[PDB]
Structure 1
Amino acid sequence: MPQPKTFGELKNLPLLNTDKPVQALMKIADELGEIFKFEAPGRVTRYLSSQRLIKEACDESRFDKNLSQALKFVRDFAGDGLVTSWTHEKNWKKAHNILLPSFSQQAMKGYHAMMVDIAVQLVQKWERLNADEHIEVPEDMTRLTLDTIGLCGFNYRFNSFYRDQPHPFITSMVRALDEAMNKLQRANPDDPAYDENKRQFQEDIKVMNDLVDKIIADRKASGEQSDDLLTHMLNGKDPETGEPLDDENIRYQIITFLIAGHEITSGLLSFALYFLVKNPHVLQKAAEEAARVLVDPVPSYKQVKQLKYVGMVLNEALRLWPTAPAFSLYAKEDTVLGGEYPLEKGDELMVLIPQLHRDKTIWGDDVEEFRPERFENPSAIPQHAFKPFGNGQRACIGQQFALHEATLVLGMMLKHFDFEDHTNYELDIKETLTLKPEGFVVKAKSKKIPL
């Protein structure tokens, strides 16, 4: 099988010692094709980029979720929360079973009011900008998505629109995520040069644990019965085991949700708005839908469901720049991938989602183009062609949450503002564990529609 250039004993590892590893891997996939082996010291994985192979990798009878090295490092603070759990860990299925009703379309109806609360704050923020002011899009999207998950997750107001300095939890979570990402490119991770990084990581873990544990303890102590994820986790019983999540796992779930609803979800909005302002006809069609559907000062859940084209904009943004750009699988047994590449039990696969989503055999030669209309009919999209939310039982539990939040907010943004790519912004995708259009800025001229 193909493999990119190697650096002696470091194998391919230095290829990921780059500011933009996902984009680096995409370029490697561009050159090497649908599958390449990627070796690092004591690690081998295969990056899959074609729907042809990924549809097989998505076969849960043959492949299970693997914790990528990145997820393994995030597990140091997301614990056995859902995204850093192995499927075979008791706490995975337990939490999966308990949390699924909390994340369904039907649950979104109950989160909707809280999402609107934050979305209106975003609108009001942009409504209150002065004429020459501009919007730092990823920053504001993250304010929105963090606040939304804080409010819907555990009735906690990060009040991100009231600050420029991040919440202590977010400082530690961002710095812990950064430490996880840095631990990946390190050729010598045991070197004492990183000893302070390891110590800071420990301090960041303890910070996140303490603040979330206190959030949990505070909720148990107040006895308050909100309808947020925290309440469901405190009160939920896994139908299978009959057991609730323990407080430790609930903390990990909360940390996981905060990670996920932070820049992973804000990236979706950031990229969506990026593609909208880069595609005025798409923007206009999306804004026309927003105006036609969002006839009330506050969007209802039902109206957000009616933002079909906005939904397609988000999918198309997810297609081009999936904010969770890769997921790892391992072969449950010896198997043959694509009739060509024999895998041994335990062999790892990486699904390079942005490259999958550029599979010209699926999307046509207009792959780079932002055409939300690609998603008019999900039935017309081949199986496993579109995997921004991962796969199978290990798919994104937050998908409905992310999409509802994004659709609501994008709908309101499109209703309330005309957007100007006033700097003719050059897409620069900053890579952390997610992707964001770094420095993406717009001007939003209010249509002066009241809320």
Structure 2
Amino acid sequence: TIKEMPQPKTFGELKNLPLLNTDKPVQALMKIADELGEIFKFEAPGRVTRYLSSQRLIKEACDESRFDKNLSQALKFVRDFAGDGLFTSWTHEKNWKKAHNILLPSFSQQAMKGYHAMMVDIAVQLVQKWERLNADEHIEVPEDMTRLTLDTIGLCGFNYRFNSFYRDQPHPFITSMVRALDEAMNKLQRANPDDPAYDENKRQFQEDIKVMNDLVDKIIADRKASQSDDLLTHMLNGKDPETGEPLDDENIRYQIITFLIAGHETTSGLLSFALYFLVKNPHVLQKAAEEAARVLVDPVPSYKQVKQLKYVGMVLNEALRLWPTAPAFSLYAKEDTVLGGEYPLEKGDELMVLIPQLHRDKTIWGDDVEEFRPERFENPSAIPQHAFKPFGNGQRACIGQQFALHEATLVLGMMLKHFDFEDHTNYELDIKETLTLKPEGFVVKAKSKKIPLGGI
């Protein structure tokens, strides 16, 4: 028998919309899920969606024969600048499968081995920056992780140096990207987006989109005036084996913007949360540091050595369990269907997967879901299907998962090998939201173990 779906408090004609009028919407939705359960309806004028938090219902949502990727309102706003790039295209648009086929080779094992040296280049810059700090100084963690991740996707993917470690202020592309993501997030609660009160928001949004595109212009120009075989090489020259066609210029521009953003923001968040959890759990930090010291025996890490940092990998997966940095994904019903044998859906109905909640399902993980325990991932293959989804689902899953994890494992391994870390301010977790999640104001002090770093 069908069941009435729980729903949060309403605001008259605005329904639930005002619940999104907060600078921390995902965290607000997590609290609503804690109060209402595995599923709740969320209505706004002219639209409805249903938020899923349990593995038993999410496993159904992840059945590709019944549901396909949907562009949530957030992705529709991001599409204003990411167009039909891979992250914001519908599965049925020609450019999705075409770009997917052309770019998948850029994330093969062979490609990853080829990216390794450039990843080390930026990682060494991070380690040198910290080695060079004076006794009285400290590290702004998310800031430096963003310097590291943006520079890494820039160099490995486009042979372009953002030179973020040569700047004391965030890189211009970052300032505009963050403002654009913040606008998309703030636009979620706007009942009347065309009210003149938002003209300055619109003007600033166009300005930020222009800055990102001006950068894309530079990357394209520098490649033209430059022999590489990287992500950009495939975007410019690769042919889809199905159609035999290469991407057109417009889509290429969207892919560059897409990869510069998806290719670093969430990885900066991951590294930031991983270091946060490590300093808050001394015993776990000790285990991870022991592995880094034992495994990374050379001046700089080799590809094989990074693959051997098992515990560091577990630490990263546990950080993704608690705070998956792209916290949700959306789906739509391909045909009428019944969810969990109790909730009838009509073709087209939308669902939102609240990843942080899925990852706190006590019926899967046990009651200690709030504890940071990397050991949960000792044998990742044994976790029930669809219980852990920080990288999305099926054919629309993250194309750069291995890239992100290789980069994060390498850098965290080097960090743990070279410094002892101190949470000198007893930092209180404050998670800033820009659709994606990242600690804000997280600072630490790093005391060098004075171990020489090898040449790049």
Q: Same-fold call, TM > 0.5?
A: yes
Cα pair 1:122 1:144 within 8 Å, conserved: yes
After superposing the two structures, state which structure 1 stretch, 247-256 or 67-76, moved more: 247-256
CA distance in 2, matches of 1:157, 1:241: 34
| C-alpha deviation, 1:227, in angstroms | 2.8
Distance 1:299 1:416 in 2: 12
- SS at 1:185's partner residue? coil
1:330 is paired with a residue whose SS is strand
Cα pair 2:81 2:209 within 8 Å, conserved: yes
State the distance in 1 between where 2:357 and 2:339 align.
Answer: 18
Q: Quick check: 2:419–2:446 contact (8 Å CA) kept in 1? A: yes
Paired residue total:
449
Between 203-212 and 330-339, the greater mean CA deviation after superposition: 203-212
TM-superposition CA deviations, 1:28-75 (whole Å, max 9, x none): 000111111111122211111011111111111111110111110000
RMSD: 1.2
Please tell me whether the aligned partners of residues 216 and 247 of structure 1 are also in contact (alpha carbons under 8 angstroms). Answer: no
1:221 Cα offset (Å): 4.6
8 Å CA contact retained: 1:136, 1:439: yes
- SS of the counterpart of 1:44? strand
Unaligned runs of 5+ in 2: none
Partner Cα separation in structure 2 for residue 107 and residue 311 of structure 1: 20
Q: For 2:47 and 2:229, how far apart are their aligned partners in 1? A: 43
Residue 204 (structure 1) shift: 2.0
Could you tell me the percent identity over the aligned residues?
100
Pick from 145, 159, 171: which aligns with 1:155?
Answer: 159
Partners of 1:107 and 1:299 lie apart in 2 by 17
Contact 2:142 2:438 in 1 (8 A): yes
SS in 1 for 2:149: helix
- In structure 1, distance between residues paired with 2:247 and 2:224: 13
User: Can you list the C-alpha shifts for 1:364-386, whole angstroms capped at 9, x where unaligned?
Assistant: 10100110110111232111000
Superposition deviation, residue 298 in structure 1:
0.7
In structure 2, how many angstroms separate the alpha carbons of the residues matched to 1:27 and 1:134?
Answer: 33
Q: 2:238 aligns with which of 236, 239, 253?
A: 236
1:404-445 Cα deviation digits (max 9, x unpaired):
110000000011111111111111111111111111111111
1:183-239 Cα offsets, whole Å, 9 max, x none, are: 1122321110111211221222233223213422442354xx313211121121111
**Residues of 2 paired with 1:299 and 1:402: CA distance?**
16
> Following superposition of structure 1 onto structure 2, how do residues 270-281 of structure 1 map, counting pairs within 5 Å?
270-281=272-283
Structure 1 residues 54-101: Cα deviation after superposition (integer angstroms, max 9, x where no partner): 111111111111011111000000111100111111111111111111
For 2:49 and 2:108, locate their aligned partners in 1 and report how far apart those are by CA, in whole Å: 33
**1:291 CA drift (Å):** 0.7
What secondary structure does 2:325 align onto? Answer: coil
Structure 2 residue matching 1:295: 3-state secondary structure: coil
* 2:258 corresponds to which of 252, 256, 262: 256
- 1:448, CA displacement in angstroms? 0.8
Distance 1:12 1:427 in 2: 27
Deviation for aligned residue 1:316: 0.3
* 1:145-181 residue CA offsets vs partner (Å, 9 max, x unmatched): 0110111120111111110233333222222212211
Q: Structure 1, residues 271-305: CA drift from partner, whole Å, max 9, x if none?
A: 00000111111111111111111111111111111
- Structure 1's unaligned 5+ residue stretches are none
Residue of 429, 440, 443 corresponding to 2:442: 440
8 Å CA contact retained: 2:23, 2:186: no
CA distance in 1, matches of 2:294, 2:249: 45
Q: Is the 8 A contact 2:143 2:170 kept in 1?
A: no
**Equivalent residues in 2 for 1:21-36 (5 A)?**
21-36=25-40
* Equivalent position SS for 1:82: coil
Alignment of 1:122-137 (within 5 A): 122-137=126-141
Contact kept, 8 Å, 1:110 with 1:227, in 2: the verdict is no
Residue 355 (structure 1) aligns with: 357
* Mapped contact 1:127–1:446 kept (Cα < 8 A): yes
Mapping of residues 318-357 of structure 1, within 5 Å: 318-357=320-359
DSSP 3-state at the match of 1:407: helix
Structure 1 Cα separation of the partners of residues 221 and 333 of structure 2 = 40
SS in 2 for 1:125: helix
Q: Distance in 2 between matches of 1:97 and 1:149?
A: 20
1:9 to partner: Cα distance: 1.1
Determine the structure 1 residue equivalent to 2:46.
42
Task: Measure the CA separation in 2 of the matches of 1:316 and 1:236.
Answer: 36
2:270 to 256, 268, 271: 268
Q: Is the 8 A contact 2:288 2:311 kept in 1?
A: yes
After TM superposition, the structure 1 stretch with the greater mean CA deviation from structure 2, 59-68 or 228-237, is 228-237
d(CA) in 2 for partners of 1:37 and 1:24? 15
